[PDB]
């Protein structure tokens, strides 16, 4: 984002407040736009944004989109008990595959990884 | 491995060439149970 | 000539090829499985 008077800034989402914009805030924004020499968004563009928000909020996600969002949050997932159990089970399956294939090098790494992940309370 | 060899023969004459076609059964591989969804993805069950 | 899928075999619970064989007491609780359950059966449909 960017203030008109100030410069560009990268901000996270939680900084924004759910409270509505007050009259002096919008007036100060208009004064900053006039100082920089900019204009306000057109009413046609305002309606286009409103329709875009309503369509996006009322949209129905597809299976592929839902799976992509789930994979994205799984990448963001630091830890979750169900997911840790599933990962440990998958690692155990990979470990038995490596043991049955007589691969003495992979199994040590999988055991070390399981030891690091494990030791619950 | 009880019946490990299926055999098909064909004495083709159409220069006599006696052709035997045979398939052998090898190893059995098993996995942990898996679940396949309608959208095509798979995961441990 | 490689691995051909010949079918799916139902797995007996708590056996060597079941997913619950390894799980300890805590992950068994996280998986909504009763620790007093002994296995020895199959889940068809």
């Amino acid at each position: 984002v960017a203030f008109p008077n100030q410069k560009e800034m990268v901000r996270p989402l939680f900084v924004f407040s759910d409270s509505s914009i007050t009259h002096p805030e919008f007036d100060l924004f208009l004064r900053e736009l006039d100082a920089e020499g900019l204009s306000v968004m057109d009413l046609r563009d305002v309606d286009y944004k409103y329709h875009q928000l309503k369509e996006m909020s009322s949209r129905s996600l597809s299976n592929d989109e839902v799976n992509s969002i789930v994979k994205m949050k799984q990448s963001l997932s630091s830890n979750t008990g169900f997911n840790t159990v599933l990962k440990k089970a998958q690692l155990q399956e990979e470990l038995e595959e490596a043991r049955d294939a007589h691969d003495h090098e992979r199994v040590a790494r999988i055991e070390a990884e399981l030891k690091s992940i494990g030791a619950e309370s | 491995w009880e019946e490990p060899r299926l055999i098909l023969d064909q004495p083709a004459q159409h220069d006599n060439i006696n052709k035997r076609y045979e398939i052998r059964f090898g190893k059995i591989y098993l996995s942990r149970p898996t679940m396949t969804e309608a959208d095509g993805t798979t995961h441990a069950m | 000539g490689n691995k051909v899928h010949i079918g799916k075999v139902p797995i007996m619970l708590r056996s060597k090829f079941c997913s619950l064989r390894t799980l300890d007491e805590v992950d068994l609780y996280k998986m909504k499985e009763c620790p007093y359950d002994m296995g020895g059966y199959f889940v068809i449909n």
């Binding site: 399956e93 990979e94 038995e96 595959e97 043991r99 049955d100 294939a101 | 190893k27 059995i28 591989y29 098993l30 996995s31 942990r32 898996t34 396949t36 095509g40 798979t42 | 691995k3 051909v4 899928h5």
Partner: peptide, 29 residues
């Protein structure tokens, strides 16, 4: 002889485990 014959029949494992990453019927279709 007793040790060899006792430990000879202890080793018995023919099936080898593997990991399925996709749906098996994919090759068929």
């Amino acid at each position: 002889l007793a040790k060899a014959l006792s430990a000879k029949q202890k080793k018995e494992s023919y099936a080898r485990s593997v990991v399925t990453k996709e749906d098996p019927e994919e090759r068929q279709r």
